[PDB]
Design a protein around this ligand. Structure first.
Ligand SMILES: *[C@@H]1O[C@H](CO)[C@@H](O)[C@H](O)[C@H]1NC(C)=O
Lengths: 50, 24
């Protein structure tokens, strides 16, 4: 009821369970990919694996 | 009825590549 005190008001809930695994990704953040370089020392990030 | 399982029924415990190793 709209007259309820805040502890007795309704709250909507979402729980985001991240399937963080050593496995192929299908959800990723909004990050731009570069070209790939080989046989040279580079800094890198593969699917967040820095 | 019953039979012996021998050493059947083992699987890859995780999705990580490994080679030339003994893993507990
Ligand atoms: C267990 O399996 C063997 C064959 O592998 C069978 O001869 C035996 O009867 C089984 N054990 C019991 C308690 O029945």
């Amino acid at each position: 009821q709209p007259t309820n005190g805040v502890g007795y008001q309704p709250y909507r809930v979402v729980v985001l369970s991240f399937e963080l695994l050593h496995a192929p990704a299908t959800v990723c953040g909004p990050k731009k990919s570069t070209n790939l370089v080989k046989n040279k020392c580079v800094n890198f990030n593969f699917n967040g694996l820095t | 009825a019953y039979t012996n399982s021998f050493t059947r029924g083992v699987y890859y415990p995780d999705k990580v590549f490994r080679s030339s190793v003994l893993h507990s």
